[PDB]
């Protein structure tokens, strides 16, 4: 298994379950509270580490207590935290989350130290990025840093995997550097300009990304699975049926487990089944990282399948 | 100045300024983040301590890091934290707060350790409550504990001051034990059944509370000040004109400073002017406790007045 380098955000998730979302000017008392480490960068770094990858993590926390704790935690999640910088005078990223009695949620985010992951910091990681087999990134880090990291990778035979979340348009210069992209429907549309409701739309949107030069395109479709497309040839790959309790980080787990499988040189079809198994498990648990399953659990799930 | 005993909640306030309140299923990135110690019990305990009172604080924090920090903090706010218990296996109370670009806010609360402040814990404080000159309470603690604390006070010549917030109806058994009550309009209506929009309504609502046996009734009216009523005789007392930046804890500061003034045996009219000065200062600053002014600042404000 080649080495993986994840570059992305780190958040401390504060989750409060409550009857209903407070209206403007209102105060509501919740029924359950949970602090769990989150952030797409870390969720994916953890999903990969736990699933068995040889991964190093480029990220930034602040100089606060919470920052030290998450750092303490990630180190035990089978992740090399040597590339995680501490930014003096800044707060560690945070996410305030409400979940109502109807199962819906709303999230408020503070970028904090995450906005400090600069091109200068990426350059300082030139060698690490150069020697890795693949680089996994999202969009909760400055675009200029993601851009600069992708170039170094493109220059040194480092596979570039991008989870284009949260949704936003991207320059062709960055897309022309991506090898594996994993957008959901909203993101696929935002990236191609094509609304994706059905498999016909997904194939069309996929085609647009392929023309940008992206070899592998996986569009998460929600309940019906993912549209897996390699160089124009795609098909819908169903996920597992499970009773969801908390879907947060489901997509991040999918991404982290997927890359682990691919860097293990498993064929795409099996890799996707592996990532789907991991995600299926993740939605049956609460909190982002606390729900990310380890390799043993993933394989056990598969074996009983 | 006689001794003051505050019994109430302790919260860690997580405040995020953002463009607009996220809609169901949405994620929004904020522009400013602040962690400040809050909770009506602590806000009032701090407002009193800083304003110069000889105050001891009965409360509960969890056995987490945040709990230790707030405890470390309150000790420097001129408060005797000897009566603050640590509850094993429980989280310190928390408040998740959003403030949009229009200045509005919504608050989500986790009771945490605060729900553990029991009658047994109050009884353990029988002597402390007995020897104090006054007891200041709110409604973010179990009603049975507030009830039991009020009885001990009633039995030992301890003045009972109640800030009936958040709004909720209360049994006549508790009201018949209150000496000073400080409801806002919503709370006054909730307590008497009389809608309070104007000074005529306020006087009527005040009358209802007086009949419950409460000698001093102060109904905060919002912009026009407070309806100060002693045994049926009331009048509107205007507050100071100021440009508000953050009104949270304004009412708690008013309460804490007010009691300090009264326990200093200042006449009600002056006591109310003192509390108003403190609150006026509080709304020009961000965060709950971080905005509570110290005695020197309050007197300076008054002198320049």
From Swiss-Prot, chains A, B:
Q: How does activity depend on temperature?
A: Optimum temperature is 30-50 degrees Celsius.
Q: Where does K(+) bind?
A: 246, 248, 282, 285, 287, 291
Q: Which cofactors does this protein require?
A: Mg(2+); Mn(2+)
- Protein activity control: Activated by a monovalent cation that binds near, but not in, the active site. The most likely occupant of the site in vivo is potassium. Also activated by ammonium ion. Ion binding induces a conformational change that may alter substrate affinity.
GO function term, MF aspect, one = ribokinase activity
Q: Which Pfam families match?
A: PfkB
User: Catalytic positions?
Assistant: 252 (proton acceptor)
Cell compartments where the protein resides: Cytoplasm
User: What EC number(s) does its UniProt record assign?
Assistant: 2.7.1.15
Per the record, the major location class is cytoplasm
The relationship between pH and activity is given as:
Optimum pH is 8-9.
Query: What reaction does this enzyme carry out catalytically?
Result: D-ribose + ATP = D-ribose 5-phosphate + ADP + H(+)
Q: Which residues bind ATP?
A: 184, 220-225, 251-252, 276
* Keywords annotated in UniProt: ATP-binding, Carbohydrate metabolism, Cytoplasm, Kinase, Magnesium, Metal-binding, Nucleotide-binding, Potassium, Transferase
The positions annotated for binding substrate are: 11-13, 39-43, 140, 252
The yes or no answer to whether the keyword Protein transport is present is: no
Q: Where does the source fall among the domains of life?
A: Bacteria
Described function: Catalyzes the phosphorylation of ribose at O-5 in a reaction requiring ATP and magnesium. The resulting D-ribose-5-phosphate can then be used either for sythesis of nucleotides, histidine, and tryptophan, or as a component of the pentose phosphate pathway.
Q: How does this polypeptide assemble, per the annotation?
A: Homodimer.
NCBIfam families reported in the protein's UniProt record: D_ribokin_bact (TIGR02152), PRK11142.1 (NF008353)
Q: What is this protein called?
A: Ribokinase
Recorded name of the encoding gene: rbsK
């Amino acid at each position: 298994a080649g080495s993986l380098v994840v570059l992305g955000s780190i958040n401390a998730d504060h989750i409060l379950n409550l009857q209903s979302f407070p209206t403007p000017g209102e105060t509501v008392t919740g029924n359950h509270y949970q602090v769990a480490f989150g952030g797409k960068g870390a969720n994916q770094a953890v999903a990969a580490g736990r699933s068995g990858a040889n991964i190093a993590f480029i990220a930034c926390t602040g100089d606060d207590s919470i920052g030290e704790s998450v750092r303490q935690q990630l180190a035990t999640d089978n992740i090399d935290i040597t590339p995680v910088s501490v930014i003096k005078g800044e707060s560690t990223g945070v996410a305030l989350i409400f979940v109502n009695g109807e199962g819906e949620n709303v999230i408020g985010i503070h970028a904090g130290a995450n906005a400090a992951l600069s091109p200068a910091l990426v350059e300082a990681q030139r060698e690490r990025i150069a020697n890795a087999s693949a680089l996994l990134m999202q969009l909760e880090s400055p675009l200029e840093s993601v851009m600069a990291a992708a170039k170094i990778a493109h220059q040194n035979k480092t596979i570039v995997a991008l989870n284009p979340a949260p949704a936003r348009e991207l320059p062709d210069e960055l897309l022309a550097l991506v090898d594996i992209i994993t957008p959901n429907e909203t993101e696929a549309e935002k990236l191609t300009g094509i609304r994706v409701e059905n498999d016909e739309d997904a194939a069309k949107a996929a085609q647009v990304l392929h023309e940008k030069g992206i070899r592998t395109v996986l569009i998460t479709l929600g309940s019906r699975g993912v549209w897996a497309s390699v160089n124009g040839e795609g098909q819908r790959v169903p996920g597992f049926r499970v009773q969801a309790v908390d879907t947060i980080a489901a997509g991040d787990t999918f991404n982290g487990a997927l890359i682990t499988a691919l860097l293990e040189e498993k064929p795409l079809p099996e890799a996707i089944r592996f990532a789907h198994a991991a995600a299926a498990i993740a939605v049956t648990r609460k909190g982002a990282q606390p729900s990310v399953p380890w390799r043993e659990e993933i394989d056990a799930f598969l074996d009983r399948q």
